[PDB]
Design a protein around this ligand. Structure first.
Ligand SMILES: O=C(O)c1ccc2c(c1)nc(Nc1cccc(Cl)c1)c1ccncc12
Length: 346
C-alpha cells in the first residue's frame, strides 16, 4: 500500500537486486542508507559504466530539498573549472516510480572508513596534506561568486575516495547545501563539525565549511574527533577547552550566547556555571592543539616519533593552518584561496 508496493513504511524504495530500470540501468545491490533515502550500485547499459544512484525518499519534504540539491549540482556543472574534480559529478537525474533518482559517478569508501582501517590511529601527515589541499580547492570552487555554495554538512563520511588505493577524494552529499543568503535552516552541521557561529545561532556564510574542514583534518591525522560533543552545550565547551572563550565581539551579537556564557559586569564573557558546580572540562584554552597533535613529541600519541614526513617543522606548519581554520571569527577565518598559499603545502 506504499507506492503501490514499491516503498517500505519509511518512504524508501525497496531495492531489488537485479532490477532493470528504463531499459538502461541494471541495479546490482544496495550500497547504504542515509537520511535522504538510499544509494545503490548500478550499471548503465548505455554508457557501459558503473554508477551510484541516489534514490530520494518518496516524501514531499525530502523531494523539495533534493530539488535544491540538484539545482546546486547542475549549477556546478555549468562551470567547467578543473576544481570540481574534487566535487562528485552528477551525471543525470530522473523520476522512477515516484522516486527522484540522482545518477552519480561510482566512487569508493569514505574517509571515516579509512580511519577505521587504521584502528583510528590516523593516517599520515603526508596523506592528510593531500586531503587538505584537494579539500581547499573544492572549497574554493564553491566560493566562486556565481556559485557561493555552502556545503553545510562537511564530515569524513561526506568525503569519498575515488579509488581505495590512491589519495584522490571528492565531496558528496550536497543535500543540506544552500547558496548564500538563501539560507533556510539554523540547525545545519553535524555536531562534531558544527561551527561556533551556528552553535551561537548567528548568521553564517561559506566559512562554516572551512571550520568543519579544520576539524576533519585533525581527526584524519589523530584518528579521533577534535570536538566530541554529546550535545550543543557539551560541544561548545569542548571547543572552549581548546580555543578558549569566544572573543567578546562575537558573543555580544550571538542570540544563543546565553546558552553557553554569561556576561560579567567587567564587560567580559565567561562560561555559565554548571548546576552541579562540578568540573567536567579543562579550563578554557588549556587543552592545547600543540599537545593534541604531538608537535614536539612525535605526533598524535607519539605514534609518528622517529619517522619520515612528520618533522617538528611539519607539525608547526600543520598546527598553524589548522588554528587558522578554527578561527572563531568567520570574517577572519582563513579562506580557501589563502589556505592554498599556506606554507603547510610548501
Ligand atoms: O550523496 C551524494 O552526493 C553521493 C554521491 C555519490 C556516492 C554517495 C553519495 N554515496 C555512496 N555511498 C554510500 C555509502 C553509505 C551510505 C550511503 Cl546512503 C551511500 C557512494 C558510493 C560509491 N560511489 C558514489 C557514492
Amino acid at each position: 500500500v506504499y507506492n503501490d508496493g514499491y516503498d517500505d513504511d519509511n518512504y524508501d524504495y525497496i531495492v531489488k537486486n537485479g532490477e532493470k530500470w528504463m531499459d538502461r540501468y541494471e541495479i546490482d545491490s544496495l550500497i547504504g542508507k542515509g537520511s535522504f533515502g538510499q544509494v545503490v550500485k548500478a550499471y548503465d547499459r548505455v554508457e557501459q559504466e558503473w554508477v551510484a544512484i541516489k534514490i530520494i525518499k518518496n516524501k514531499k519534504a525530502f523531494l523539495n530539498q533534493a530539488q535544491i540539491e540538484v539545482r546546486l549540482l547542475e549549477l556546478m556543472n555549468k562551470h567547467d573549472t578543473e576544481m570540481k574534480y574534487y566535487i562528485v559529478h552528477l551525471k543525470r537525474h530522473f523520476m522512477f516510480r515516484n522516486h527522484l533518482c540522482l545518477v552519480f559517478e561510482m566512487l569508493s569508501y569514505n574517509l571515516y572508513d579509512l580511519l577505521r582501517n587504521t584502528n583510528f590511529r590516523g593516517v599520515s601527515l603526508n596523506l592528510t596534506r593531500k586531503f587538505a589541499q584537494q579539500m581547499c580547492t573544492a572549497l574554493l570552487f564553491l566560493a566562486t561568486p556565481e556559485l557561493s555554495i555552502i556545503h553545510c554538512d562537511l564530515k569524513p563520511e561526506n568525503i569519498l575516495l575515488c579509488n581505495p588505493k590512491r589519495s584522490a577524494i571528492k565531496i558528496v552529499d550536497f543535500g543540506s547545501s544552500c547558496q548564500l543568503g538563501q539560507r533556510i535552516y539554523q540547525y545545519i552541521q553535524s555536531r562534531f563539525y558544527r561551527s561556533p557561529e551556528v552553535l551561537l545561532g548567528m548568521p553564517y556564510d561559506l566559512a562554516i565549511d572551512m571550520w568543519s574542514l579544520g576539524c576533519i583534518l585533525v581527526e584524519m591525522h589523530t584518528g579521533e574527533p577534535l570536538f566530541s560533543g554529546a550535545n550543543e552545550v557539551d560541544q561548545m565547551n569542548k571547543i572552549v577547552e581548546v580555543l578558549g572563550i569566544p572573543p567578546a565581539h562575537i558573543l555580544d551579537q550571538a542570540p544563543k550566547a546565553r546558552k553557553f556564557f554569561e556576561k560579567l559586569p567587567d564587560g567580559t564573557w565567561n562560561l555559565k556555571k554548571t548546576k552541579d558546580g562540578k568540573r567536567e572540562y579543562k579550563p578554557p584554552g588549556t587543552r592545547k592543539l600543540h599537545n593534541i597533535l604531538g608537535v614536539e613529541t612525535g605526533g598524535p600519541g607519539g605514534r609518528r616519533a622517529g619517522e619520515s614526513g612528520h618533522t617538528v617543522a611539519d607539525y608547526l606548519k600543520f598546527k598553524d593552518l589548522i588554528l587558522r581554520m578554527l578561527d572563531y571569527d568567520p570574517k577572519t577565518r582563513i579562506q580557501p584561496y589563502y589556505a592554498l598559499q599556506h606554507s603547510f603545502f610548501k
